[PDB]
Design an enzyme around this catalytic site. Structure first.
Site, PDB file in Angstrom:
ATOM      1  CB  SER A  53      -0.940   0.006   1.206  1.00  0.00           C
ATOM      2  OG  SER A  53      -1.626  -1.228   1.327  1.00  0.00           O
ATOM      3  N   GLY A  54       2.016   1.182   0.655  1.00  0.00           N
ATOM      4  CA  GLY A  54       2.926   2.311   0.727  1.00  0.00           C
ATOM      5  C   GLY A  54       3.890   2.369  -0.442  1.00  0.00           C
TER       6      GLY A  54
ATOM      7  N   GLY B 218       1.069  -8.494  -2.473  1.00  0.00           N
ATOM      8  CA  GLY B 218       2.017  -9.399  -3.096  1.00  0.00           C
ATOM      9  C   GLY B 218       2.331 -10.626  -2.263  1.00  0.00           C
TER      10      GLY B 218
ATOM     11  CB  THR C 115      -3.431   3.976  -4.156  1.00  0.00           C
ATOM     12  OG1 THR C 115      -3.642   2.886  -3.251  1.00  0.00           O
ATOM     13  CG2 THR C 115      -4.752   4.695  -4.394  1.00  0.00           C
TER      14      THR C 115
ATOM     15  CD  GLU D 134       1.233 -10.680   3.491  1.00  0.00           C
ATOM     16  OE1 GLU D 134       0.977 -11.561   4.340  1.00  0.00           O
ATOM     17  OE2 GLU D 134       0.651  -9.576   3.459  1.00  0.00           O
TER      18      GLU D 134
ATOM     19  CG  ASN E 246       2.530  -1.611   4.833  1.00  0.00           C
ATOM     20  OD1 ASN E 246       2.437  -0.512   5.378  1.00  0.00           O
ATOM     21  ND2 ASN E 246       2.476  -1.764   3.515  1.00  0.00           N
TER      22      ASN E 246
ATOM     23  CB  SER F  66      -1.163  -4.431   4.947  1.00  0.00           C
ATOM     24  OG  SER F  66      -1.069  -5.556   4.092  1.00  0.00           O
TER      25      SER F  66
END
Length: 922
Positions: free
Chosen positions: A163-164, A425, A168, A427, A205, A208
């Site tokens: 997400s980071g 993705g 997005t 993990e 994270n 996430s």
């Protein structure tokens, strides 16, 4: 600067024979090979200059400078994780965040605002192929849009990352392109809403995605957007009822509890963070982020979407009720049945929902199964947990559909779509619980989708080039690993065995492992820990690598029993919101995950997949820094290195006829004619001349296919031949110049006059002060080059070069020293001929003076006892002048005059003239 240096390599911002070796340090470094001992290699490093030991299986080759910062990594002649790491790293520090690896599009987050993504740039990517422009997210979008219209089938773009990672942000760019080409803002307002209910803090994270996000952009038959809709896959509902240590459930829970007003807490019956069972590890904060303010941010975000206050508050009731489920306390005493001595709970639950408190109590303790089945203590808590998990999942799917209703469709227009898949993705943790097995299982099929896609895309490429070569489907490589996890019985897989062990109450996590090892120990992708007792129970081989799974609490996490009596109550609930969620009524967690994934794969396999890889350069969220190990780990997880693994088996390097000729033609100088072209046979002549092994290359229609490492060799042969051909050129032009000048210096003809002699004197002195020095110190350069050539020559593991016809530096200055001694012999013979010419000048001057003195005497005496007196004067002046003329001629002969008879005959002619003068007197 803008935007020229962030795309093109040539516009970007700023031969020791080295190979890559494993390191901690930097991800990979360079080393000189030198000595080899046994099966192991002993090397020494470059930039630092320290020495270390490694293996020979740990050595990955390095690419030539030609392949530095490639736009497509399939063009690399050396394909390995080290080169992949290097090229990406080299481009990142150069400001280029976009790179193609095979079919993949790799984008590393710059953590900066790059002046790309403007209408000028968008219009510049239109109707162009992928290689025609530098790597960009727009090309993948362009690839999807252009294929949708032409190939008549739906498209999908698979984005992998965190997400980071700005996944997005990257998705926004994809939609930005498709919007400008086909002629909304609210689709970007949906992201913070889903982020609240769908995202949670993990160990790696703080934010996430626990759900897959599929954004469908619908296009009409004419290629214009008729609207959009969102689909969600593989939501994790187990996170609501329980969380791992240091991990939090979905954000909305912490935002609600902290952010709600005093009146809200009384209406929703909210309690403290330590008062809820379904919240593990109590209240966990997050650095930089505060839940209280995010709550209000989440509220207004839903308001802009057009959510009414009643709709929002209804959702907040469900969130509150989910937590209230866990607070229900069942007890056990000595017959076998569940009991609830505490009535204060379940009153709140039935009030928040639409259930009758008396009906519910009877239902949860003693359900009616199609009559009145009894449940124990263990069954009740599980049934409660599943109800919370189911309700929250139904809440999520409602939130999605509610957003889809708030999306504008300006055309009825049954259409076609281009999907964008946003999913977490691969993990890999140091623990890897049941949740990790699921996310790896779905990513396994996703990578299989890539392998199959690459298998189809490449085999149709070989046909277009008319190359016949057969290879097995690369998707089949993940098939055993998939069947290991997913299959009902052959013999039953990890998911199937977990469902069977949950059927029996006396079974434990230990008995699950023992049966798993027992059922399949034979499976190639199934392995056991080394020795003693390891933390993890077992291991499964994926495309990413070997991961260690611990089976602790797996039987607990897989339980999802659905109470059909309570479910009907929620369907018949007096609350219209709750009734809608449970409107459709129909069971293990793994069974539903397999079911939900099969639904997702079915949609993707009916489309044409595209792949974007988002990479996080560092954990510090700072620009200009790239953690090589972090990137390497991601490259193993996303399948980029897996894509590299596949192309190596084939002929990855594909070079068109002309650019292959232009580059390597110097290797076969006389093989190729003077350019009668046709361009295909020119390469066939080069390969024949090079004697290149037929197994290392393939000749296609427009291009030549090469194995990995082939171009590395040819590029290395070019470097040697280039300096060799350049040397032998400038050497011959220098030598012949010396031979042509020295031959001119030995020429003894200086001309017939005195002016001609000094003409060479002025030319020779102006030669040494002008023409000689550039030719003079070029010898010193050629010797430096010859030495520089001899050095780089033996770094290639070769033999030294022998220069023919005395072109060696020691034979050059030998000809140069022979040339410089011939200059004075030319110069000394010049002053000898100079004096000689001056002695001729004076003698010729006196000769003409005497002869033309008698001319006038013969003339003026032609006017005539004084006669014999003047007759005597004649013969005296005759004898004296003749004796002087004879003296001059005699001195000229020893000086080797070449006009001697010219003067002698002219003298004799005047003797006839004087004879007329003596005859006239008579």
């Amino acid at each position: 600067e803008d935007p020229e240096r962030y795309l093109f390599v040539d516009r970007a911002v700023i031969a020791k024979k080295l190979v890559w070796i494993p390191s901690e340090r930097h991800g990979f470094e360079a080393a000189s090979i030198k000595e080899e001992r046994g099966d192991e290699v002993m090397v020494e490093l470059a930039e630092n200059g320290k020495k270390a030991m490694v293996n020979k299986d740990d050595i990955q080759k390095m690419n030539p400078p030609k392949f530095s910062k490639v736009e497509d990594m399939a063009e690399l002649t050396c394909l390995n994780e080290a080169s992949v790491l290097h090229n990406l790293k080299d481009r990142y520090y150069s400001g280029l965040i976009y790179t193609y690896s095979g079919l993949f599009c790799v984008v590393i987050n710059p953590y900066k605002n790059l002046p790309i993504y403007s209408e000028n740039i968008i219009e510049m990517y239109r109707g162009k192929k992928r290689h025609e422009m530098p790597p960009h997210i727009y090309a993948i979008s362009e690839s999807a849009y252009r294929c949708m219209l032409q190939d008549r089938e739906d498209q999908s773009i698979l984005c992998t990352g965190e997400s980071g990672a700005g996944k997005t942000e990257n998705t926004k760019k994809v939609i930005q392109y498709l919007a400008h080409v086909a002629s909304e803002r609210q689709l970007l307002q949906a992201n913070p809403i889903l982020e609240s209910f769908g995202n949670a803090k993990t160990v790696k994270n703080d934010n996430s995605s626990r759900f897959g996000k599929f954004i469908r952009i619908n296009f009409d038959v004419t290629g214009y957007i008729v609207g959009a809709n969102i689909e969600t896959y593989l939501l994790e509902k187990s996170r609501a009822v329980r969380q791992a240590k240091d991990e939090r459930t979905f954000h909305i829970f912490y935002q609600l509890l902290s952010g709600a007003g005093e009146h809200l807490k009384s209406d929703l019956l909210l309690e403290g963070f330590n008062n809820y069972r379904f919240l593990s590890n109590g209240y966990i904060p997050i650095p930089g982020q505060q839940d209280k303010d995010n709550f209000q941010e989440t509220m207004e975000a839903m308001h802009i979407m057009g959510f009414s206050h009643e709709e929002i508050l209804s959702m907040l009731k469900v969130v509150s009720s989910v937590l209230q489920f866990g607070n229900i306390s069942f007890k056990k005493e000595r017959t076998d049945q569940a009991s609830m001595p505490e009535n204060t709970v379940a009153q709140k639950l039935c009030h928040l929902l639409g259930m009758n408190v008396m009906e519910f109590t009877r239902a949860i303790l003693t359900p009616r199964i199609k009559v009145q089945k009894a449940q124990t203590k263990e069954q009740a808590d599980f049934a409660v947990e599943a109800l919370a998990k189911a309700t929250y999942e139904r809440l999520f799917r409602w939130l999605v559909h509610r957003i889809n209703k708030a999306l504008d469709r300006t055309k009825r227009q049954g259409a076609s779509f281009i999907g964008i898949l946003d999913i977490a993705g691969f993990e890999i943790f140091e623990l890897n619980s049941f949740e990790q097995l699921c996310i790896n299982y779905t990513n396994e099929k996703l990578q299989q989708l890539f392998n199959h896609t690459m298998f189809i895309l490449e085999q149709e490429e070989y046909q277009r080039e008319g190359i016949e070569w057969n290879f097995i489907d690369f998707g089949l490589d993940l098939q055993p690993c998939i069947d290991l996890i997913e299959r009902p019985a052959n013999p039953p897989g990890v998911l199937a065995l977990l469902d069977e062990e949950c059927w029996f109450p006396k079974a434990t996590d230990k008995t699950f492992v023992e049966k798993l090892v027992q059922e399949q120990g034979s499976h190639s992708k199934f392995q056991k820990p080394r020795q003693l007792k390891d933390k993890a129970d077992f291991c499964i081989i994926h495309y990413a690598g070997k991961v260690d799974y611990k089976a602790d609490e797996w039987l607990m996490k897989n339980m999802d029993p659905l109470n059909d009596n309570v479910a009907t109550l929620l369907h018949q609930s007096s609350d219209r919101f709750v009734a809608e969620l449970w409107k459709d009524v129909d069971r293990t967690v793994g069974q539903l995950y397999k079911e939900s994934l099969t639904k997702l794969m079915a949609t993707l396999r009916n489309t044409n997949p595209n792949f974007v890889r988002c990479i996080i350069p560092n954990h510090e969220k700072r620009a200009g820094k790239l953690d090589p190990h972090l990137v390497l780990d991601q490259l193993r997880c996303n399948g980029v290195l897996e894509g590299i693994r596949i192309c190596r088996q084939g002929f990855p390097n594909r070079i068109v006829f002309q650019e292959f000729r232009q580059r390597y033609e110097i290797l076969t100088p006389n093989a190729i004619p003077k350019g009668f072209m046709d361009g295909k046979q020119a390469c066939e002549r080069m390969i024949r001349a090079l004697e290149l092994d037929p197994n290392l290359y393939r000749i296609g229609q427009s291009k030549i296919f090469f194995r990995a490492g082939v171009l590395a060799h040819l590029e290395e042969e070019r470097a040697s031949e280039q300096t060799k051909s350049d040397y032998l050129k400038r050497a011959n032009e220098l030598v012949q110049w010396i031979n042509d000048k020295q031959a001119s210096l030995e020429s003894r003809d200086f001309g017939d006059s005195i002016e001609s002699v000094q003409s060479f004197m002025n030319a020779h002195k102006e030669y040494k002060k002008t023409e000689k020095p550039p030719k003079g110190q070029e010898v010193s350069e050629l010797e430096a080059i010859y030495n520089s050539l001899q050095t780089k020559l033996r770094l290639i593991k070769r033999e030294p070069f022998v220069a023919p016809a005395g072109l060696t530096p020691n034979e050059i200055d030998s000809t140069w020293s022979a040339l410089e001694k011939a200059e004075q012999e030319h110069a000394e013979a010049l002053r000898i001929e100079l004096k000689r010419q001056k002695k001729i000048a004076v003698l010729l001057q006196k000769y003409n003076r005497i002869l033309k003195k008698l001319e006038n005497w013969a003339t003026t005496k032609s006017v005539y006892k004084n006669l014999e007196a003047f007759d005597g004067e004649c013969q005296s002046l005759e004898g004296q002048s003749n004796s002087d003329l004879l003296s001059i001629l005699a001195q000229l002969t020893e000086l080797n005059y070449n006009g001697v008879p010219e003067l002698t005959e002219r003298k004799d002619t005047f003797f006839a003239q004087q004879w007329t003068g003596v005859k006239s007197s008579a």
